[PDB]
Amino acid sequence: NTVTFN
Amino acid sequence: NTVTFN
Amino acid sequence: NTVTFN
Amino acid sequence: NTVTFN
Amino acid sequence: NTVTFN
Amino acid sequence: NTVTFN
Amino acid sequence: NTVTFN
Amino acid sequence: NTVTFN
Amino acid sequence: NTVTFN
Amino acid sequence: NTVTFN
Amino acid sequence: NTVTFN
Amino acid sequence: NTVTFN
Amino acid sequence: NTVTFN
Amino acid sequence: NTVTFN
Amino acid sequence: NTVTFN
Amino acid sequence: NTVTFN
Amino acid sequence: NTVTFN
Amino acid sequence: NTVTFN
């Protein structure tokens, strides 16, 4: 599972 | 599962 | 499952 | 399942 | 299932 | 099932 | 699992 | 598992 | 496991 | 807007 | 907006 | 916005 | 925003 | 923002 | 932001 | 920010 | 920031 | 910052 906060 | 916050 | 917040 | 918020 | 908010 | 909000 | 805070 | 704080 | 604070 | 998939 | 996948 | 995958 | 994967 | 993977 | 992997 | 891997 | 690997 | 490897 992947999470990116931009 | 993938989540991207832009 | 995929979620993108733009 | 896919969700995109634009 | 797909959901797009524009 | 598909939903698009424009 | 991966998390990136930008 | 990987975490990057930018 | 890897953690980078930038 | 609201969507529910049952 | 709100989406729920059941 | 809110998404829940059940 | 909030996402929950169950 | 918040993500929870269950 | 918050992420929890369960 | 907070991450927890369980 | 905080990370916990369990 | 804080990291704990359990």
Curated annotation (Swiss-Prot), chains A, B, C, D, E, F, G, H, I, J, K, L, M, N, O, P, Q, R:
Subcellular location(s): the record lists: Cell membrane; Secreted, Cell wall
Q: How is it modified after translation?
A: N-glycosylated and O-glycosylated. The GPI-anchor is attached to the protein in the endoplasmic reticulum and serves to target the protein to the cell surface. There, the glucosamine-inositol phospholipid moiety is cleaved off and the GPI-modified mannoprotein is covalently attached via its lipidless GPI glycan remnant to the 1,6-beta-glucan of the outer cell wall layer.
For this chain, the family text in UniProt reads: Belongs to the ALS family.
Q: What does this protein do?
A: Cell surface adhesion protein which mediates both yeast-to-host tissue adherence and yeast aggregation. Plays an important role in the pathogenesis of C.albicans infections. Forms amyloid structures, essential for cell-cell association and cell-substrate adhesion to polystyrene.
Q: How does it assemble?
A: Forms homodimers through the tandem repeats. Aggregates in amyloid-like structures, with self-propagating secondary-structure changes, amyloid-characteristic dye binding, and induced birefringence.
Domains: entry comment:
Each ALS protein has a similar three-domain structure, including a N-ter domain of 433-436 amino acids that is 55-90 percent identical across the family and which mediates adherence to various materials; a central domain of variable numbers of tandemly repeated copies of a 36 amino acid motif; and a C-ter domain that is relatively variable in length and sequence across the family.
The name under which this protein is listed is: Agglutinin-like protein 5
What is the species of this protein? Answer: Candida albicans (Yeast)
